[PDB]
């Protein structure tokens, strides 16, 4: 029934926002921030979920077991012989 809880589900898997969840009874208190926002008369901005889905979703090859720097030094070392 609140406006913010009306969430369309994402098709792709979204990256998780990490926060500590407030309990719903505490946030709906009369002195709280969120009692004014659970009313439908407040201005609830619609997020663009398509953009969030777009941005926040999840020769032969010389195979070497070494990093590029040590291979570079070894090649510079070997070609002087």
């Amino acid at each position: 029934v609140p406006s913010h809880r009306r969430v369309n589900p994402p098709t792709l898997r979204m990256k998780k926002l990490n926060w500590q969840k407030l309990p719903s009874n505490v946030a709906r208190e009369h002195n709280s921030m969120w009692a004014s926002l659970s009313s439908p008369d407040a201005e609830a901005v619609e997020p663009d979920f398509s953009s969030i889905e777009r941005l926040f979703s999840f020769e032969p090859k010389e195979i070497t077991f070494l990093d590029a720097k040590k291979s570079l030094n070894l090649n510079i070392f070997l070609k002087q012989f």
Binding site: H4, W19, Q20, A27, N31, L55
Partner: protein, 291 residues
């Protein structure tokens, strides 16, 4: 750069222009000792034969209640310095709490952040929540996109530029909340309480002193005690607004709900301006690349 008689008469006259905190601290650290005072009082010869140091000490001994007068100089300049450093900061703290308790675009902004967080964490235990703590605004920059360039806060201020730009007027309400306190309020509160106790002791000593010291210094002592009582009333108002801010953000008052909220909110407003700046730089660099 003057004689012993002029600084002696300036100490007696109550003039504080050439007497700041450090000079009076040196003078109190170069107070005469008991045997020095007794030897100068038992000095019976010609006082021109003494040094200028001993002549200055005899001029200092000639001043009645001279140590109490020097204490009055030091406490007046110290009380003035303490009020000048503490009172605009305490006024900024009171204005910070007053504009934190009431805000216009901040419910719309935190409702939008709650909608986006409910979209991101849908199906989890944290999702379908009616709210969050004030520390989530620090944690807005933690969540960050595929390209590792745009954070969640940067994305929110990017979309808020085109949709609802009144959120860009959000730091205008938070400028008296901005810059926090700078220092801990309890330490300068203890300094103000110690200064008020010292000034009350000094007024009791002046009331025990002669009428010359009373007419010279009692009105300054009364003005300083009145200003420090107004400062203590301001501290009590800050305590009341601290309890109001603790009940406003749904946190218990036993934890630090005064300075931590100022630091969290100051860092969040700096991240707001920094995210605005980086999104403007991203838009300008994209425009330059397009050109």
């Amino acid at each position: 750069k003057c004689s012993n008689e002029e600084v002696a008469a300036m100490i007696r006259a109550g003039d504080t222009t050439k007497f700041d905190v450090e000079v009076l601290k040196q003078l109190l650290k170069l107070l005469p000792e008991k045997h020095e005072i007794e030897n100068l009082r038992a000095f019976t010869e010609e006082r021109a034969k003494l040094a200028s140091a001993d002549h200055f000490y005899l001029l200092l001994l000639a001043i009645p209640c001279y140590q109490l007068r020097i204490e009055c100089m030091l406490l007046c300049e110290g009380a003035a310095a303490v009020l000048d450093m503490v009172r605009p900061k305490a006024q900024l703290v009171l204005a910070a709490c007053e504009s934190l308790l009431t805000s216009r675009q901040l419910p719309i902004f935190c409702q939008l952040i709650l909608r986006i967080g409910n979209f991101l964490n849908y199906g989890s235990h944290t999702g379908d929540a009616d709210g969050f703590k004030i520390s989530t605004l620090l944690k807005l920059t933690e969540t960050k996109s595929q390209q590792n360039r745009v954070t969640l806060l940067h994305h929110v201020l990017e979309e808020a530029e085109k949709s609802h730009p009144d959120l860009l007027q959000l730091p205008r309400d938070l400028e008296q909340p901005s810059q926090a306190a700078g220092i801990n309020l309890e330490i300068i509160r203890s300094e103000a309480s110690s200064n008020l106790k010292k000034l009350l002791e000094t007024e009791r000593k002046v009331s025990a002193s002669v009428a010359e010291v009373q007419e010279q210094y009692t009105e300054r002592l009364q003005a300083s005690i009145s200003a420090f009582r107004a400062l203590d009333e301001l501290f009590e108002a800050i305590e009341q607004k601290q309890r109001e801010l603790a009940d406003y953000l749904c946190e218990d008052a036993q934890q630090l709900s005064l300075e931590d909220t100022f630091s969290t909110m100051k860092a969040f407003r700096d991240l707001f301006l920094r995210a605005l700046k980086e999104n403007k730089d991203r838009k300008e660099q994209a425009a330059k690349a397009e050109r």
